[PDB]
Structure 1
Amino acid sequence: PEMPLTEVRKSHLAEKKELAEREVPKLTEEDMEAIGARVFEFLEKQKRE
């Protein structure tokens, strides 16, 4: 038989559930494009110098 969860463990679980419920940070296409453009600019600058 599985051992029951103590109070602290339950509270931690609840916190984790709350965290999950919130909207997750996800890397957008736009952000990637912005990064990629900056990388390209950096490469161009390196080539120049």
Structure 2
Amino acid sequence: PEMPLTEVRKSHLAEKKELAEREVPKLTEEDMEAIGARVFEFLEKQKRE
């Protein structure tokens, strides 16, 4: 038989559930494009110098 969860463990579980419920940070296409453009600019600058 599985051992029951103590108070602290339950509270931690609840916190984890709350965290999951919130909207997750996800890397957008736009952000990637912005990064990629900046990388390209950096490469161009390196080539120049």
TM-score normalised to the size of structure 2?
A: 1.00
* Structure 2 unmatched ranges of 5 or more: none
Whole-Å separation in 2 of the counterparts to 1:10 and 1:42: 49
CA RMSD of aligned residues (A): 0.0
TM-score, normalised on structure 1?
1.00
Percent of aligned pairs with the same amino acid: 100
Structure 1 unpaired stretches of 5+: none
1:41 positional shift: 0.0
- Number of residue-to-residue matches in the alignment: 49
Structure 1 segments of 4 or more deviating over 3 A? none
Secondary structure at 2:37 match in 1: helix
